[PDB]
Design a binder for this molecule. Structure first.
Ligand SMILES: [Zn+2]
Length: 257
Protein backbone atom coordinates (compact mmCIF):
# COMPACT_ATOMS: atom_id res chain seq x y z
CA UNK A 1 0.00 0.00 0.00
CA UNK A 2 0.96 3.66 -0.40
CA UNK A 3 3.17 5.49 2.09
CA UNK A 4 6.31 7.58 2.24
CA UNK A 5 9.01 4.94 1.85
CA UNK A 6 11.43 4.41 -1.02
CA UNK A 7 9.18 1.84 -2.63
CA UNK A 8 5.68 3.25 -2.02
CA UNK A 9 6.23 7.00 -1.72
CA UNK A 10 4.73 9.96 -3.59
CA UNK A 11 6.44 9.16 -6.92
CA UNK A 12 4.57 5.82 -6.94
CA UNK A 13 1.10 7.01 -5.99
CA UNK A 14 -0.04 7.64 -9.57
CA UNK A 15 -0.14 3.90 -10.31
CA UNK A 16 -3.06 3.36 -7.93
CA UNK A 17 -4.35 6.95 -8.02
CA UNK A 18 -3.95 8.36 -11.52
CA UNK A 19 -5.34 11.75 -10.42
CA UNK A 20 -1.90 12.15 -8.84
CA UNK A 21 -0.96 13.68 -12.22
CA UNK A 22 -4.12 15.80 -12.43
CA UNK A 23 -4.80 19.45 -13.10
CA UNK A 24 -5.27 20.69 -9.54
CA UNK A 25 -2.96 18.70 -7.28
CA UNK A 26 -1.53 19.81 -3.92
CA UNK A 27 0.70 20.88 -2.35
CA UNK A 28 2.34 23.58 -4.50
CA UNK A 29 5.14 26.08 -4.20
CA UNK A 30 3.81 29.53 -3.36
CA UNK A 31 5.77 32.04 -5.39
CA UNK A 32 5.23 35.17 -3.32
CA UNK A 33 6.07 37.58 -6.12
CA UNK A 34 3.61 35.96 -8.57
CA UNK A 35 0.69 35.61 -6.10
CA UNK A 36 -1.69 38.51 -6.67
CA UNK A 37 -3.45 40.51 -4.00
CA UNK A 38 -7.19 40.07 -4.43
CA UNK A 39 -9.01 42.93 -2.67
CA UNK A 40 -12.35 41.15 -3.10
CA UNK A 41 -11.28 38.36 -0.73
CA UNK A 42 -12.93 38.67 2.69
CA UNK A 43 -11.32 38.26 6.06
CA UNK A 44 -11.25 34.69 7.16
CA UNK A 45 -13.69 33.79 9.93
CA UNK A 46 -12.35 31.09 12.25
CA UNK A 47 -14.99 30.23 14.85
CA UNK A 48 -13.55 27.54 17.12
CA UNK A 49 -14.98 28.69 20.50
CA UNK A 50 -17.43 25.72 20.68
CA UNK A 51 -15.01 23.13 19.27
CA UNK A 52 -15.44 19.63 20.67
CA UNK A 53 -12.35 17.48 20.23
CA UNK A 54 -12.92 13.76 20.81
CA UNK A 55 -10.02 11.47 20.01
CA UNK A 56 -6.51 11.29 18.61
CA UNK A 57 -5.62 8.50 16.18
CA UNK A 58 -2.39 7.21 14.66
CA UNK A 59 -3.57 6.10 11.21
CA UNK A 60 -0.19 4.88 9.95
CA UNK A 61 0.55 8.05 7.92
CA UNK A 62 0.00 10.83 10.49
CA UNK A 63 -2.11 11.33 13.60
CA UNK A 64 -5.54 12.96 13.43
CA UNK A 65 -7.10 14.96 16.27
CA UNK A 66 -10.79 14.39 15.53
CA UNK A 67 -13.75 16.66 16.33
CA UNK A 68 -17.52 16.32 16.71
CA UNK A 69 -18.72 17.55 13.32
CA UNK A 70 -22.39 16.55 13.78
CA UNK A 71 -23.30 20.22 14.46
CA UNK A 72 -21.85 23.64 13.55
CA UNK A 73 -19.46 23.87 16.54
CA UNK A 74 -16.11 24.73 14.97
CA UNK A 75 -16.42 26.31 11.56
CA UNK A 76 -14.48 28.17 8.92
CA UNK A 77 -16.25 30.80 6.79
CA UNK A 78 -15.38 33.88 4.74
CA UNK A 79 -12.17 34.45 2.88
CA UNK A 80 -12.52 32.73 -0.50
CA UNK A 81 -15.30 30.48 0.79
CA UNK A 82 -19.00 30.45 0.09
CA UNK A 83 -20.93 28.91 2.93
CA UNK A 84 -19.91 27.11 6.09
CA UNK A 85 -17.24 24.48 6.54
CA UNK A 86 -17.11 22.25 9.64
CA UNK A 87 -13.89 21.16 11.29
CA UNK A 88 -13.51 17.37 11.19
CA UNK A 89 -9.85 16.84 12.10
CA UNK A 90 -6.40 18.29 12.15
CA UNK A 91 -3.07 16.62 11.55
CA UNK A 92 0.53 17.47 10.70
CA UNK A 93 3.23 16.66 8.17
CA UNK A 94 6.85 16.81 9.37
CA UNK A 95 10.44 16.02 8.55
CA UNK A 96 13.32 13.96 9.81
CA UNK A 97 15.34 17.21 9.96
CA UNK A 98 14.27 20.81 10.67
CA UNK A 99 15.09 21.78 7.04
CA UNK A 100 12.19 19.83 5.60
CA UNK A 101 8.70 18.64 6.53
CA UNK A 102 6.20 21.02 5.04
CA UNK A 103 4.14 20.20 1.97
CA UNK A 104 3.56 23.72 0.68
CA UNK A 105 6.72 25.73 0.19
CA UNK A 106 7.18 29.50 0.06
CA UNK A 107 9.58 30.66 -2.64
CA UNK A 108 10.88 27.08 -2.48
CA UNK A 109 11.48 27.36 1.28
CA UNK A 110 10.54 24.24 3.23
CA UNK A 111 9.37 24.59 6.82
CA UNK A 112 9.93 21.98 9.55
CA UNK A 113 6.31 20.95 9.52
CA UNK A 114 2.84 21.90 8.35
CA UNK A 115 -0.49 21.76 10.20
CA UNK A 116 -3.71 21.01 8.25
CA UNK A 117 -7.08 21.83 9.78
CA UNK A 118 -9.54 19.99 7.60
CA UNK A 119 -13.12 21.27 7.14
CA UNK A 120 -16.03 20.09 4.96
CA UNK A 121 -18.80 22.10 3.29
CA UNK A 122 -22.06 21.64 5.18
CA UNK A 123 -24.12 21.89 1.99
CA UNK A 124 -22.98 18.34 1.14
CA UNK A 125 -24.15 16.78 4.42
CA UNK A 126 -21.17 14.57 5.24
CA UNK A 127 -17.43 14.40 4.62
CA UNK A 128 -17.68 11.42 2.25
CA UNK A 129 -20.03 13.32 -0.05
CA UNK A 130 -18.03 16.53 0.28
CA UNK A 131 -14.80 15.03 -1.05
CA UNK A 132 -16.60 14.21 -4.31
CA UNK A 133 -17.23 17.93 -4.96
CA UNK A 134 -14.81 20.60 -6.28
CA UNK A 135 -15.72 22.90 -3.37
CA UNK A 136 -16.20 20.15 -0.79
CA UNK A 137 -13.32 20.86 1.61
CA UNK A 138 -11.48 23.85 2.99
CA UNK A 139 -8.08 23.12 4.53
CA UNK A 140 -6.34 25.72 6.65
CA UNK A 141 -2.59 25.18 6.36
CA UNK A 142 -0.18 26.58 8.92
CA UNK A 143 3.60 26.36 8.77
CA UNK A 144 5.73 25.34 11.76
CA UNK A 145 9.26 26.58 12.33
CA UNK A 146 11.60 25.52 15.12
CA UNK A 147 12.25 28.14 17.79
CA UNK A 148 10.26 28.88 20.94
CA UNK A 149 7.72 26.35 22.15
CA UNK A 150 4.06 26.58 21.21
CA UNK A 151 2.15 26.22 24.54
CA UNK A 152 -1.03 25.21 22.73
CA UNK A 153 0.73 22.26 21.07
CA UNK A 154 2.09 20.67 24.24
CA UNK A 155 -1.08 18.73 25.11
CA UNK A 156 -0.88 17.12 21.66
CA UNK A 157 2.75 16.06 21.86
CA UNK A 158 2.38 14.71 25.41
CA UNK A 159 -0.29 12.17 24.40
CA UNK A 160 1.78 10.75 21.51
CA UNK A 161 3.49 8.07 23.63
CA UNK A 162 0.02 6.54 24.02
CA UNK A 163 -0.55 6.32 20.23
CA UNK A 164 2.94 5.38 19.13
CA UNK A 165 1.90 2.85 16.54
CA UNK A 166 -0.57 2.50 13.67
CA UNK A 167 -4.17 1.87 14.72
CA UNK A 168 -3.79 3.21 18.26
CA UNK A 169 -6.18 5.87 19.49
CA UNK A 170 -6.71 7.74 22.76
CA UNK A 171 -9.35 9.96 24.28
CA UNK A 172 -8.56 13.59 23.40
CA UNK A 173 -11.33 15.78 24.74
CA UNK A 174 -11.39 19.48 25.55
CA UNK A 175 -8.56 20.48 23.25
CA UNK A 176 -8.74 24.02 21.94
CA UNK A 177 -7.38 24.37 18.40
CA UNK A 178 -7.29 28.17 18.76
CA UNK A 179 -3.98 27.56 20.56
CA UNK A 180 -2.40 26.42 17.30
CA UNK A 181 -3.07 29.65 15.36
CA UNK A 182 -0.57 32.41 14.61
CA UNK A 183 -1.40 36.03 15.36
CA UNK A 184 -2.22 37.04 11.79
CA UNK A 185 -4.77 35.42 9.52
CA UNK A 186 -3.22 36.82 6.28
CA UNK A 187 -3.29 33.97 3.75
CA UNK A 188 -2.77 32.69 0.24
CA UNK A 189 -5.51 30.69 -1.43
CA UNK A 190 -5.79 28.40 -4.48
CA UNK A 191 -7.86 25.39 -5.64
CA UNK A 192 -6.25 22.05 -5.07
CA UNK A 193 -6.48 18.54 -3.71
CA UNK A 194 -6.04 16.18 -0.78
CA UNK A 195 -2.29 15.62 -0.35
CA UNK A 196 -2.73 11.95 0.54
CA UNK A 197 -4.47 9.30 -1.51
CA UNK A 198 -7.08 9.37 -2.84
CA UNK A 199 -5.73 12.79 -3.84
CA UNK A 200 -9.23 14.06 -4.66
CA UNK A 201 -9.50 17.50 -6.24
CA UNK A 202 -11.97 18.84 -3.72
CA UNK A 203 -10.03 21.39 -1.64
CA UNK A 204 -9.97 25.14 -1.35
CA UNK A 205 -6.56 25.67 0.23
CA UNK A 206 -6.06 28.56 2.63
CA UNK A 207 -2.40 28.77 3.68
CA UNK A 208 -1.49 31.26 6.38
CA UNK A 209 1.52 33.48 5.76
CA UNK A 210 2.65 33.62 9.40
CA UNK A 211 4.22 30.38 10.69
CA UNK A 212 3.90 29.27 14.27
CA UNK A 213 7.01 28.50 16.31
CA UNK A 214 7.40 25.17 18.05
CA UNK A 215 10.38 23.98 20.12
CA UNK A 216 12.97 21.45 19.09
CA UNK A 217 11.73 19.23 21.94
CA UNK A 218 8.20 19.42 20.54
CA UNK A 219 9.32 18.34 17.05
CA UNK A 220 11.51 15.57 18.51
CA UNK A 221 8.36 14.06 20.00
CA UNK A 222 6.62 14.00 16.61
CA UNK A 223 9.62 12.07 15.25
CA UNK A 224 9.23 9.31 17.88
CA UNK A 225 5.94 8.15 16.40
CA UNK A 226 5.84 4.98 14.29
CA UNK A 227 4.36 4.26 10.85
CA UNK A 228 4.22 0.57 11.77
CA UNK A 229 1.82 -1.30 14.01
CA UNK A 230 2.64 -2.68 17.42
CA UNK A 231 4.86 -5.75 17.27
CA UNK A 232 6.19 -4.82 13.83
CA UNK A 233 9.69 -3.60 13.01
CA UNK A 234 10.05 0.07 13.99
CA UNK A 235 9.88 2.63 11.18
CA UNK A 236 9.88 6.17 12.53
CA UNK A 237 7.04 8.38 11.35
CA UNK A 238 9.08 11.13 9.71
CA UNK A 239 9.04 12.78 6.28
CA UNK A 240 5.34 12.13 5.84
CA UNK A 241 5.04 14.97 3.34
CA UNK A 242 4.24 15.08 -0.34
CA UNK A 243 6.45 17.45 -2.35
CA UNK A 244 5.23 20.38 -4.42
CA UNK A 245 3.21 19.53 -7.53
CA UNK A 246 2.91 21.45 -10.82
CA UNK A 247 0.75 24.61 -10.55
CA UNK A 248 -0.61 24.17 -14.07
CA UNK A 249 -3.53 26.44 -14.89
CA UNK A 250 -3.93 28.01 -11.44
CA UNK A 251 -3.42 31.43 -9.82
CA UNK A 252 -2.57 31.78 -6.17
CA UNK A 253 -4.33 34.79 -4.61
CA UNK A 254 -3.15 36.73 -1.55
CA UNK A 255 -5.42 38.28 1.03
CA UNK A 256 -2.82 40.94 1.86
CA UNK A 257 -0.34 43.32 0.24
ZN1 LIG B 1 -2.36 17.02 5.43
Amino acid sequence: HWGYGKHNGPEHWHKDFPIAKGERQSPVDIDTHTAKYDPSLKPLSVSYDQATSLRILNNGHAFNVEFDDSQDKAVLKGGPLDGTYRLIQFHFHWGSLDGQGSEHTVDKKKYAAELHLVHWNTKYGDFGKAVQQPDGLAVLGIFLKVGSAKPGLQKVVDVLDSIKTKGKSADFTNFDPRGLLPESLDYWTYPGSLTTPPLLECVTWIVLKEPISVSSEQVLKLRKLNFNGEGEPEELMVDNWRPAQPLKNRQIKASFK
